[PDB]
Design a protein around this nucleic acid. Structure first.
Ligand code: ZN
Ligand code: ZN
Lengths: 293, 48, 147, 114, 209, 97, 192, 278
DNA sequence: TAGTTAAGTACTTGAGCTTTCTGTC
RNA sequence: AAGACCAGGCU
DNA sequence: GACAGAAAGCTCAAGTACTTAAGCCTGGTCTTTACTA
């Protein structure tokens, strides 16, 4: 009855403590249209109170790029507080940081009990799920080996995010659940790692048991979350930004699959959305859930 | 309280009943009194 | 105030299940680090920077009156949920609070006090870096800061 | 000037005035260790904060692929062409746009400002 | 120092002569208009250990209707005024048989001395004025319109014409700076004449309460 | 009246909100009565002044015979009377209208 | 190269932003003027704007020429990432493209970054529309409750419910506000 | 510009480059290199080295750019410090010839003749930097100077021909308001100087001035958008707000301090409490 | 079957400084 | 019956 | 009788309790009583 009540009424907590219980979860699924059903199944809610007149948490933040649809929000008191997921966005399910710590102990790291606190200034700190585990003195090779192992899927799951903040000398590793991430193509030097044989095999995908998981396992595509993007140099398209010009940049490390993947389910049905005004795109994203079919 | 006053039981129980009656009488007029436990219906719902 | 102008900025901690603010040095001494060199060695990772010393100095002076670990534990217990009748009861309650409700992700077994000291020292160091302007304040709407 | 510690209990030295010899000394109030001060300064305060940030910036920032880099400005000691450049981070100065340069090659950690 | 203090005293005296002229007291045109150099020559330039002490500056002016009423303006030498000093001023006031006087305080007055001013009210009426308040004539500001104190006969005619009881009029409090400037008491009615961009002119009446 | 206007309106803003549009009204009269500007007029200049003076008495905002009522009436209608006299000037009537 | 001199009363950042905004606004205005001059007499956009039925000269400029700079909270697009706006740009890039200047027009279509910056720009307008209403309504209600009893009596005086006099004549001239029009004094301005 | 510098608040901290506390046990045998010269010039025929003089030295440096921007004088600074604190500091200061602009401060001579000496010198530094108030009027953060292009801030006068001529004159706009002392100031125009604060205008000029100033503020905030609202509504609002003789805010407090019927008040913002009091 | 969040104003309270009367010289 | 939550629409 | 100290007093800054929080409209679903005795 506890599971049944909390899933039926929507109040999330004890029924006797319903005053302290959070509400609004587990709404009735919308069946007006298939697009409405999909948008309802892919939706995010900010717990910030709807009554708050503070504008800041409602504004479209830069870090929503590729993760949350910029066009699709409800109109009213909930503007910017209810957000829909991008098409290629994936939410991490979480994993235990048991193998990562063991590999770090194998990779010459110093435990938190054995540091001489005089040598802690030059070395780089290492964080795992927020917990400071130890220090390391060669961040470059460590970060290279970690990225190689993640790309080979060997002992680091592709859902694990690794971040090196050079100026603050910190290295952060998250295996935590709830992190939002999206796939990107790896760029080595000025060239994509995606080549014509991969495309041939994917075009012959039927009766070849070769799929997106085999594409991931080859080290061609990589999952990247929000705060790892801070250390990423992204190219909008390969044929345009990888080729030599009067150069803006040469250290590109990743490339988007396609720029249209930043839109949500309801905003992906709009023809020519870049030729319209953004309020009109938002209005269409809201009205598409009410279109009959 | 009328019964306990007719019995004359113990001055402590009379005072406790007086406090309880004060709470209920005040809470019938005002249930939004801060610093005090707001009255509850058997549902766990607060009174109007 | 005369005191406030002389001291400057003091660092205080709001521990769970504890009534009011507690100075950082008192918490560090309660963790088992009596000596000021060890406390500053956990707070400040490089002794050649005088601005960090100038920022930290008033906090040391505020908590000079407590020098013993048991005295610091009694000081913390006096501000617990309820004042314990006996001093050792307050000491035990404060020790339990500092083992369980203080930084549970760092550890729970009684060996982990050293790691708790490092993590608290890192927190204070990050606060000092923000106060010196050497780091940018964290953005609450940064979508990587969210789960 | 900066902190120093008593050599027996490793606690803070703080300054006192000797009244007879009329000299300053450092005494740790947890003990009787008295040590004559060699710096005649106990407290300094750089109100205008005109300290150049070259000491705050590290040479490891050269490995950041998202920083810009130009061939125009050469390094002084080695003359490697490549040098990543970036802006100040001091919040409180009479200027806010000057570029800090770090030499890009693996062993030359040379940092300079134009 | 002393040139600026001379300038302040000249400003205060000019504002006090304008005050007295506006209250209906006999003030000659030369006293209304005194150049800084003329005032300097009259009162002997620098004040500090100099000729214009604060006590050198007191003003006696006579009312136009009756020369018996008169009025004194005092300039206490102390930064703060006390009950003793106010009692000395009241003793001089009784000796000279005058009924109305002012006090120009350099910084402020103790509440015990403020209560002493009002305690005297049926006998002798004393009004406190801060030094800064008299450093400029607020009546000459563009925002302040013209204020005219009405007589009792005019107030009666006003109330008979509009058939109004006294409390039905707009009000002005006695602590209003303009009410302090004109020395207006509770129960009196002021007439305000201000220009309007719809009519051209408009007259408003404020009761003093 | 010009001196009064210059006192009332510093900065010289001549745009004023008033009840009845005298220029439109004069233009209506010209077209209603088929007035030829090319020909001499038969309107005696005394009657312009006298009609303006008599009309100004018939525009009453404050009713009363007391001096207070007269002053209130004058203050209420000062701006409109100034505008009316400016527009119904005898020279202006003889030249333009 | 530190050759820019700071304007009086302004920070170096403030004057740098002012100069860049001046340049971009001048560019957007010139392009709009050229686009408006290029319009034919048969153009339906011009036929709608000139008559004042709907649309405007800035709408024509944004449709044909340049959408223009996008602003958030009255400022140019901020740095949500560490020292850059998007992961596509390099750190410390204050150029027009990096900070939200939309070079293309609606007819030509926007690039992906300009599209995201325009979405950020429209979100601010949507938020302001959603937020301002409560405060405006609360002000309106408080004004009405404060003034509800003020009324013109048969004395032509304006009095509240307590018969206290607020104005001796309504509007200080006693006239209703619907029959009045704008006029010129014709005696105020002339030379003597 | 002279009036701008005379109107703006300036603390000693803005013109001070850096501060250091030294220990110099004897006047003449100084630990700094350059101070020896003027030290001997002042102490060869010593000014008040008559009682004992304290081992602890306070030493402030002054940036020449900020010192000369505000037309300050080191003699002025020494006079202001000495007058503000009394004789409890002895001030030693350099001539302007010295490239390193130094003001050598020691605690009272009559104290070396409660707080510990160096700690007291730190507390003095922390007091001077925030409180010394070298120039101008406090609560005045910044003052801006510009030539207005709008006719509503331009001085318009009547020429000898009776025409209206608009003049361009420098005007100042401050951040922070202290109206009374600014109206007192030399060469400031008392007739036309105004602020945007309503309570500040009230407590200075009275109720009719607030009537007019509030009318102007409301007109500005309504007509800034380009819209037009008839004068009568603005006049009625101002008259209702200023009718009772004091500033009646249009809130529950201001509306319910009117002596109206309780049934009118219960219908606005305090329903049960109004009736309870009645 | 019975019970069982963020703003803003008004009011209170505690720190700092006046008069007057009462005692002692 | 009534109460509660939620979603959407028009400004 | 003249000084000083101790008095009641008084005023003036911090801290605390309390208030409001756009208008209209359409639906849907869920639940009042489950737990001790
Ligand atoms: Zn020691
Ligand atoms: Zn180099």
């Amino acid at each position: 009855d506890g599971l049944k009540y909390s899933l039926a009424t929507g109040n999330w907590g004890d029924q006797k403590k319903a005053h302290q219980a959070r509400a609004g979860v587990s709404q009735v699924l919308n069946r007006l249209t298939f697009a409405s059903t999909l948008s309802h199944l892919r939706r995010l809610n900010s717990p910030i109170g709807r009554d708050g007149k503070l504008a800041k948490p409602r504004q479209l933040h830069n870090t929503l790029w590729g993760m949350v649809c910029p066009a699709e929000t409800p109109e009213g008191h909930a503007v910017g507080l209810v957000k829909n997921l991008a098409l290629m966005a994936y939410i991490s399910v979480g994993s235990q940081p048991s193998p990562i710590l063991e590999f770090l102990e194998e990779w010459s790291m110093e435990n938190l009990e054995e540091i001489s606190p005089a040598a802690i200034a030059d070395a780089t700190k290492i964080f795992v799920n927020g917990c400071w585990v130890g220090i390391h003195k060669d961040p470059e090779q460590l970060m290279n080996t970690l990225r190689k192992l993640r790309r080979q899927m060997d002992i680091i799951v592709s859902e694990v995010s690794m971040i090196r903040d050079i100026r603050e000398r910190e290295i952060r590793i998250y295996t935590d659940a709830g992190r939002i991430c999206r796939p990107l193509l790896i760029v080595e030097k000025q060239k994509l790692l995606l080549k014509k044989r991969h495309i041939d095999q994917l075009k012959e995908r039927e009766y070849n048991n070769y799929s997106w998981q085999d594409l991931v396992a080859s080290g061609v595509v990589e999952y990247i979350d929000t705060l790892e993007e801070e250390t990423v140099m992204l190219a909008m398209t390969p044929d345009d930004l990888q080729e030599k010009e009067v150069a803006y940049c040469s250290t590109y490390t990743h490339c988007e699959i396609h720029p249209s993947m930043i839109l949500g389910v309801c905003a992906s049905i709009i023809p020519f959305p870049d030729h319209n005004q953004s309020p009109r795109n938002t209005y269409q994203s809201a009205m598409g859930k009410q279109a009959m079919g | 309280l009328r019964r306990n006053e007719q019995n004359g039981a113990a001055a402590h129980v009379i005072a406790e009943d007086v406090k309880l009656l004060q709470f209920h009488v005040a809470t019938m007029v005002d249930n939004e009194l801060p610093g005090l436990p707001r009255a509850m219906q058997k549902s766990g719902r607060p009174l109007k | 105030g005369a005191k406030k102008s002389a001291i400057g900025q003091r660092i205080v901690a709001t521990l769970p299940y504890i009534k009011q603010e507690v100075p950082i040095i008192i918490v560090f001494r309660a963790l088992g680090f009596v000596s000021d060199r060890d406390i500053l060695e956990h707070i400040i990772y490089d002794f050649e920077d005088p601005e960090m010393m100038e920022m930290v100095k008033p906090s040391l002076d505020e908590a000079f009156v407590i020098q013993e670990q048991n005295v610091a534990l009694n000081f913390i217990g006096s501000r617990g949920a309820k004042p314990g009748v006996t001093k050792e009861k307050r000491i035990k309650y404060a020790k339990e609070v500092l083992q369980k409700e203080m930084l549970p992700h760092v550890g729970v077994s009684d060996f982990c006090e050293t790691k708790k000291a490092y993590f608290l020292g890192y927190m204070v160091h990050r606060l000092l870096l923000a106060a010196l302007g050497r780091r940018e304040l964290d953005d609450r709407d940064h979508y990587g800061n969210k789960r | 000037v900066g902190i120093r510690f008593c050599q027996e209990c490793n606690n803070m030295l703080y300054p006192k005035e000797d009244k007879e010899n009329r000299i300053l000394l450092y005494a740790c109030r947890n003990c009787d260790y008295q040590q004559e001060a060699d710096n005649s300064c106990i407290y300094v305060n750089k109100i205008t904060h005109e300290v150049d940030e070259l000491t705050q910036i590290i040479a490891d920032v050269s490995q950041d692929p998202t920083l810009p880099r130009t061939e125009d400005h050469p390094c002084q000691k080695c003359g490697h062409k490549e040098a990543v450049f970036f802006q100040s981070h001091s919040a409180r100065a009479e200027d806010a746009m000057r570029l800090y340069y770090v030499c890009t090659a693996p062993h030359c950690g040379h940092r300079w400002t134009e | 120092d002393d040139e600026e203090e001379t300038y302040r005293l000249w400003k205060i005296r000019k504002t006090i002569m304008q005050l007295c002229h506006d209250r209906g007291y006999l003030v000659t045109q030369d006293e209304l208009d005194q150049t800084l150099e003329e005032f300097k020559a009259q009162s002997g330039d620098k004040p500090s250990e100099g000729r214009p002490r604060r006590t050198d500056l007191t003003v006696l002016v006579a009312h136009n209707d009756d020369p018996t009423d008169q009025m004194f303006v005092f300039f206490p030498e102390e930064p703060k005024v006390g009950i003793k000093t106010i009692k000395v001023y009241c003793q001089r006031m009784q000796e000279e048989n005058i009924t109305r006087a002012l006090i120009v305080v350099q910084q402020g007055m103790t509440p015990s001395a403020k209560q002493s001013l009002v305690d005297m009210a049926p006998k002798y009426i004393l009004e406190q004025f801060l030094q800064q308040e008299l450093l400029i004539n607020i009546t000459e500001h563009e925002l302040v319109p013209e204020h005219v104190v009405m007589t009792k006969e005019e107030v009666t005619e006003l109330l008979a014409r509009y058939k109004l009881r006294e409390n039905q009029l707009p009000r002005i409090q006695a602590g209003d700076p303009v009410a302090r400037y004109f020395g207006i008491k509770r129960g009196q009615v002021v007439k305000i004449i201000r220009p309007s961009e719809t009519a051209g002119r408009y007259i408003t009446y404020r009761l003093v309460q | 009246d010009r001196e009064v206007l210059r006192v009332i309106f510093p900065t010289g803003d001549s745009k004023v909100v008033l009840p009845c549009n005298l220029l439109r009204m004069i233009w209506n009269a010209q077209k209603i009565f088929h007035i030829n500007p090319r020909l001499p007029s038969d309107l005696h200049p005394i009657k312009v002044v006298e009609g303006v003076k008599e009309l100004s008495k018939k525009l009453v905002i404050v009713n009363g015979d007391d001096p207070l009522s007269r002053q209130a009436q004058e203050n209420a209608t000062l701006l409109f009377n100034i505008h009316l006299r400016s527009t119904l000037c005898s020279r202006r009537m003889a030249e333009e209208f | 190269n530190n050759e820019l001199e700071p304007t009086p009363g302004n920070t170096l950042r403030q004057t740098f932003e002012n100069q860049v905004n001046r340049i971009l606004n001048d560019a957007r205005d010139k392009t709009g003027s050229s686009a408006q001059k290029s319009l034919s007499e048969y153009n339906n956009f011009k036929s709608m704007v000139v008559s004042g039925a709907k649309g405007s000269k800035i709408n024509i400029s944004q449709v044909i020429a340049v959408v223009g700079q996008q602003n958030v909270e009255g400022k140019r697009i901020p740095f949500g990432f560490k020292h850059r706006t998007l992961p596509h740009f390099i750190k410390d890039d204050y150029g027009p493209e990096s900070r939200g200047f939309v070079e293309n027009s609606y007819l030509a279509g926007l690039t992906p970054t300009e599209f995201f910056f325009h979405a950020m720009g429209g979100r601010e307008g949507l938020i302001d529309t959603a937020v301002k209403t409560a405060e405006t309504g609360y002000i309106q209600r408080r004004l009405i409750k404060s003034m509800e009893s003020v009324m013109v009596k048969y004395d032509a005086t304006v009095r509240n419910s307590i018969n206290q006099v607020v104005q001796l004549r309504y509007g200080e001239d006693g006239l209703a506000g619907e029959s009045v029009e704008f006029q010129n004094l014709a005696t105020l301005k002339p030379s003597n | 510009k002279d009036i701008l510098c005379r109107l703006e608040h300036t603390t000693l901290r803005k013109v001070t480059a850096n501060t250091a506390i030294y220990y110099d046990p004897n006047p003449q045998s100084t630990v700094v290199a350059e101070d020896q010269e003027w030290v001997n010039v002042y102490y060869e025929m010593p000014d008040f080295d008559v009682a004992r003089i304290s081992p602890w030295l306070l030493r402030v440096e002054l940036d020449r750019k900020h010192m000369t921007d505000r037309k300050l004088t080191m003699e002025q600074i020494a006079e202001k410090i000495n007058a503000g604190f009394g004789d409890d500091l002895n001030c030693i200061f350099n001539d302007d010839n010295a490239e390193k602009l130094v003001l050598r401060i020691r605690i009272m001579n009559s104290d070396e003749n409660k707080m510990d000496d160096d700690v007291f010198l730190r507390c003095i530094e922390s007091n001077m930097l925030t409180d010394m108030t070298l120039q101008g009027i406090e609560q005045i953060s910044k003052v801006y100077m510009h030539l207005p292009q709008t006719d509503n801030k331009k001085k318009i006068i009547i020429t000898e021909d009776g025409e209206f001529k608009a003049l361009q004159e420098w005007i100042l706009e401050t951040d922070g308001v202290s109206l009374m002392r600014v109206l007192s100031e030399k060469d400031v125009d008392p007739v036309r100087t105004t602020s945007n604060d309503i309570v500040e205008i009230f407590t200075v000029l009275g109720i009719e001035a607030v009537r007019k100033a509030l009318e102007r503020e409301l007109y500005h905030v309504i007509s800034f958008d380009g819209s037009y609202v008839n004068y009568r509504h603005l006049a009625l609002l101002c008259d209702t707000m200023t009718c009772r003789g004091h500033l009646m805010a249009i809130t529950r407090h201001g509306v319910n301090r009117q002596d109206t019927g309780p049934l009118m008040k219960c219908s606005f913002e305090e329903t049960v409490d109004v009736l309870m009091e009645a």
